[PDB]
């Protein structure tokens, strides 16, 4: 017969102002700042805060099969997280699209 209601003032509970619009205005470094940001929040309490990065990544980067790069990486490669930085750098070049930054 438990749990006494209470309150908070952080904003929404755990969240970060960060996301953008397109790799183009992201330096590798902010991509690193972004993705590793799953290393933290994900393992956290809730998955209504993860779907935020999850679906920006999936959006801006396009191919090969979004999340799959984040999640089921590749056996002989980089497993967490500078290989999704790597292997992504490929796609956009063979399929037209511009790249990272300064």
């Amino acid at each position: 017969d438990a749990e006494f209601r209470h309150d908070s003032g952080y904003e929404v509970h755990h969240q970060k102002s960060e996301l953008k619009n397109s790799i183009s205005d992201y330096t590798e470094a902010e991509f690193v700042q972004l993705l590793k940001e799953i290393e933290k929040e994900n393992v956290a309490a809730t998955d209504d805060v993860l779907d935020v990065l999850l679906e920006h990544f999936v959006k801006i980067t396009e191919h090969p099969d979004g999340t799959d790069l984040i999640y089921y990486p590749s056996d002989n490669r980089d497993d967490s997280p500078e290989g999704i930085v790597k292997e992504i750098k490929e796609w956009r070049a063979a399929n037209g699209k511009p790249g990272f930054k300064q």
């Epitope: 006494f4 209470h6 309150d7």
Partner: antibody
Framework: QVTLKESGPGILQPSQTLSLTCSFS??????????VSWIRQPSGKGLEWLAH???????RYNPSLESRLTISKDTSRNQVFLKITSVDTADTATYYC?????????????????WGQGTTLTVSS | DIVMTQTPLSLPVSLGDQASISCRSS???????????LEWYLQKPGQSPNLLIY???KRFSGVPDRFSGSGSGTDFTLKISRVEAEDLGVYYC?????????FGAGTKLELKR
């Protein structure tokens, strides 16, 4: 200036119904945000907790009671209430209303800064 | 109901003598939002309580740097390193994470002779 004032009959009689009124000064119950708890202490014993309201008429009762207890307020009047049904000899007690305050904006820092004096009820026929 | 436990239930001493009490919550009081809503109350003779310390260890308005109190999870302690008269009274620990919100039973710090 904040001060808390309980009030009642002070001398009831068995299986009936009480009403406790708790009353504020110096500040206001609308954008105060604080909550209000009823805690009673029996003549020559400890302390026990009866109920609680929140800045938005939210009401949370001790299960080891609940059915008897009834808590409420008015912001216009600027006071919090408490009915206990079929009052029994067991209710014989000094009753305390209590503000559940905090450190401003840091809402989750909730304690009981300020407790009133106490309104004493004897329930004997 | 839920139970909080005090040790001692009566601690008598003379003035300027260091004092210290302890409360253990039958099962952890660490509230889902993360914090440990435990308080340390006091009933000076013939008048109300009287908060002192909230959230394990943050000391409330105007209560001297002397009335410390640390702890964690279930164990928690209070200390007066200078018992004075404004200190002698009943001391109740308390919880605030689960309904109901239960005080200890009450230690009666007091004058020794």
């Amino acid at each position: 200036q904040v001060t808390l004032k309980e009030s009642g009959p002070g001398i009831l009689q068995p299986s009936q119904t009480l009403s406790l009124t708790c009353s504020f000064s110096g500040f206001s119950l609308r954008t105060s945000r604080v909550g209000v708890s009823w805690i009673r202490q029996p003549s020559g014993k400890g302390l026990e907790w009866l109920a609680h309201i929140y800045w938005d008429d939210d009401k949370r009762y001790n299960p080891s009671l609940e059915s008897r207890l009834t808590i409420s307020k008015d912001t216009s009047r600027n006071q919090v209430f408490l009915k206990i049904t079929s009052v029994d000899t067991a209710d014989t007690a000094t009753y305390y209303c209590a503000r559940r305050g905090f450190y401003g904006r840091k809402y989750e820092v909730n304690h009981f800064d300020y407790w009133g004096q106490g309104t004493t009820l004897t329930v004997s026929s | 109901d839920i139970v909080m436990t005090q040790t001692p239930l009566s601690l008598p001493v003379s003035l300027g003598d260091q004092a210290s009490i302890s409360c253990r919550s039958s099962q952890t009081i660490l509230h889902s939002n993360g914090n440990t809503y435990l308080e340390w109350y006091l009933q000076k003779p013939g008048q109300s309580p009287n908060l002192l310390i909230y959230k394990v260890s943050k000391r409330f308005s105007g209560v001297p740097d002397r009335f410390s109190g640390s702890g964690s999870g279930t164990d928690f302690t209070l200390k007066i390193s200078r018992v004075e008269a404004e200190d002698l009274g009943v001391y109740y620990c308390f919880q605030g994470s689960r309904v109901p919100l239960t005080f200890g039973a009450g230690t009666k710090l007091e004058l020794k002779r």
